[PDB]
Amino acid sequence: DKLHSQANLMRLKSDLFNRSYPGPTKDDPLTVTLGFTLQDIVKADSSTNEVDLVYYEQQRWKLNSLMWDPNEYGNITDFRTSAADIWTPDITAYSSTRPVQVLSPQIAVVTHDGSVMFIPAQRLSFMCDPTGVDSEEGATCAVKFGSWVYSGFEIDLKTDTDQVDLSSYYASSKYEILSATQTRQVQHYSCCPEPYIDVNLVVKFRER
Amino acid sequence: KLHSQANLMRLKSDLFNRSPYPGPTKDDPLTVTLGFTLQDIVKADSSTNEVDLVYYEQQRWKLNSLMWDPNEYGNITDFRTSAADIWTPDITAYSSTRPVQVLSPQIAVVTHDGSVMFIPAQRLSFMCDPTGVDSEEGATCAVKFGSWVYSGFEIDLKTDTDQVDLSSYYASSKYEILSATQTRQVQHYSCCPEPYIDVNLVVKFRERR
Amino acid sequence: DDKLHSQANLMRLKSDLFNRSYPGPTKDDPLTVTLGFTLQDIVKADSSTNEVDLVYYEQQRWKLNSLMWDPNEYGNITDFRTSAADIWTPDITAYSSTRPVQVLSPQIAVVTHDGSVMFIPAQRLSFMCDPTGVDSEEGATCAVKFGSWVYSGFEIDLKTDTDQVDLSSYYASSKYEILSATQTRQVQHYSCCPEPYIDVNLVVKFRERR
Amino acid sequence: DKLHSQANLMRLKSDLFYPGPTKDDPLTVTLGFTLQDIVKADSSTNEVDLVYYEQQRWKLNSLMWDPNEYGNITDFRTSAADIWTPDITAYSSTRPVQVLSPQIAVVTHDGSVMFIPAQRLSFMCDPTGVDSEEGATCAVKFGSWVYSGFEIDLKTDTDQVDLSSYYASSKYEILSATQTRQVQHYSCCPEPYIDVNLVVKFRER
Amino acid sequence: DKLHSQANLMRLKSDLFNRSPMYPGPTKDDPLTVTLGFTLQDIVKADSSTNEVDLVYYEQQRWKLNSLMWDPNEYGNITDFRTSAADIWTPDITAYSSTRPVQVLSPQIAVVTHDGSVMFIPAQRLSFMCDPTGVDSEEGATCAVKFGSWVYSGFEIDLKTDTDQVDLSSYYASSKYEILSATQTRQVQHYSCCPEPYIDVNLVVKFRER
Ligand SMILES: N#C/N=C1\SCCN1Cc1ccc(Cl)nc1
Ligand SMILES: N#C/N=C1\SCCN1Cc1ccc(Cl)nc1
Ligand SMILES: N#C/N=C1\SCCN1Cc1ccc(Cl)nc1
Ligand SMILES: N#C/N=C1\SCCN1Cc1ccc(Cl)nc1
Ligand SMILES: [Mg+2]
């Protein structure tokens, strides 16, 4: 039995990854759903106005080219796969000051309806003035995330909720979270006439 | 000696070329045994609440596809191989604050019964408030380790003991270990209804007197 | 059906362009790279080593005949996104960096049917800069040149659209405020070689926020 | 002539280009350390940083040739990626080692290989006493991570660390530095384990 | 005309690299001489707590291989070309007393000329063993660092300089440190492993606080 289930998977993957995705286009656009789970505000540097966050970001999208019929494949309904084997969106912070450091395995889950889920954990340094962190109202900082190169005509972004998930926030962090929201926005950049979509992460925090 | 080399090369070729591992599935789940050997608490940063640990993580699992009959291969009963040649579990700390730094060669040992042993040494920074480390009672912190992407239906975990191996702990570390335990736990994450399995490392420590 | 066809068309175009045939510019086939800087933040100024750290992105544009197509032969595809590894890109280098530049954006470019390419890397750069005076009304002045490391002005020319650095995305709560920032084309000569080399010199006047 | 020698070498390398040692086909690796500098001693974390190079030597039958079949080529330089190399590891490092020299080895026609990696290492070391006449003492063991003494034996030519290239203006002076082969057994396993223990006594210059 | 020039270049590069097995490096029977020369841009940092100094410089390297020769007449009168350093053999020039891996600051691209000669000019940031005691005095501090092939003896790789004077023409004028002198000198070394002599170029820099 088990030998055939392994074989059914190896076959599914072979069939998918070796019979045919060039990325989204204006004719074939994509919606990426984004959500943030903030784990820690590690460091706030008032000498450079950089703050370091640890969080994970749930990403979801769906491709017709990743679809299969589970009956054709021993009732496999989903699988884990290296993120290198598939297209992934180029979700980038707009005001980082250091390259993101990746903290989790680059492996995604693909489902038979063609939907993909990928949940990278990251440490990010970004532009933030923490003046006021030692006050009751705390400091407020914001960072936009979205595709670096795909306009709103190729990649649209959505959230499931405007509330950042704080259920895993580190109970003994140096900083407590007063509020954290994630909200879709439209931008234009100087290069191009097309609008570009971002999700803006806004965090209000203070010294515990 | 010529024959023995040829026998090993043949085995590896048979296993890695002439045979078809896409990872565990709900239909073919895997149990990984995990244990920790703590070598050093290097740094405890009270300004960011990060602690740095150096440890070895013993991983063991068994695959039917790695099995062979030693009698067919000159009585070879195990071999060393690059961790790149085989599947390995995506064991991840839940509350790291920086990418782990790998401190040992990425080489595993495969045995004829299909079992694999792999023992990466690593430096880890993780979320830990060291308040109390300057007192008799010390500081206590914890970090969970488990598959990032495979639920308990695909990867289960277990330990061989509740006690973290402290027999190699650095005798002149800045910190001494009061207790160190490792315990299987079940978690649920927002994305998904399935349970995810971890081994929780709980360490009580204080400044050396 | 339509979405299946558009994908097939793009895959086919990319196949035709990249699988079925550019060794860089030469004196017989030279190239112009238009450069523009958008300065986001002066992160740090270290007076103990005379290094300043900047975050910016750099818009780069050029055009190749080899990247041309008729949208009509490809379902009216007029442009596409592509990994920067799939195409030639110019070796634009800061002359007085003190650390390898850190890349902050995905290495992906946009290619248009007229053969034009746009690539906009975001970078954190440490460069040689004496911040003396930063604590004064007048501020400090530093400069860093950007150009091809290996291609002379006979192979790669540089152009700017304006001599003004784009400050519309400068971080409003940076430790440093920008008094002015200019980008100016220049010609240099190096010891190795008789040929002139082109650079764009970024000059930044800044002070501690007041 | 020069084109003939190029082709002779190209041919030798192609003709030559081993799954590692085993209980049945064990290997002895000779090790020797040359200490260049104690760069840093951090009393806040008990870490010390060393710069040194390590001479590694071993011999493989699979790497032998007759020079007369190859234009009297007696040795060649080769990328360490092209050959098997021993997984010699510090056992109490606190950072990944940093490689300071090209990963190229020399192979000789008798199948012997020489490889001399220079490295910066941070390792577990309490420097208490460095500011006194007696100085500080620290130790770090080096050995295979994955092979037991039944697969890889270690040999040294000397128990003296080579100090002839020690930086004369280092922040730290070396009082002594030894490298001692140790054989031991652990609770887990019947087979012997072999390491070379580097012991360094040093003090502020 | 331009399309022919590109075709000529890709043909030449295919004839040299694609239809020839990579040069196996120098040997006693086919030895090589590498010319080296340094251009010092900045002494960035001098750490008296560890006795490490950090230098930013570029290093011009030149060598010549018969296997890289062509007749420009067979190739549209192409007399030289830029190429990725990964396409060709390059010397393993290493500092003997570095304390961290070198950081590369320029694109790893070289120029190959039709006589088989190669020019490659890497910019690097190097930390090396140096006691800066006396940098705050009029006489300054003196440090030295040797460079050469880590693995090839003088029977395989010899070195030479064009001058014993380090090029100071691009030294950062507002560095924390001023250069009093900087020389580069060929030496013959013997290492413990081996009877053969090894060649280095010793860089000696005298410097003091600005
Ligand atoms: N949310 C969530 N899921 C998390 S956070 C800790 C690990 N996981 C499980 C998971 C599940 C699926 C994917 Cl693609 N990635 C991760
Ligand atoms: N200017 C500009 N464009 C920017 S800055 C933030 C992301 N973008 C959009 C973009 C558009 C095209 C390319 Cl090649 N790269 C980036
Ligand atoms: N000397 C010199 N040349 C320099 S320093 C800054 C860029 N250049 C031009 C150049 C020319 C050729 C090569 Cl191989 N490398 C660099
Ligand atoms: N000992 C020694 N040899 C050294 S230290 C500086 C460079 N060399 C020469 C060398 C010779 C051979 C090999 Cl494999 N590696 C290095
Ligand atoms: Mg909106």
Ligand SMILES: [Mg+2]
């Ligand atoms: Mg070998």
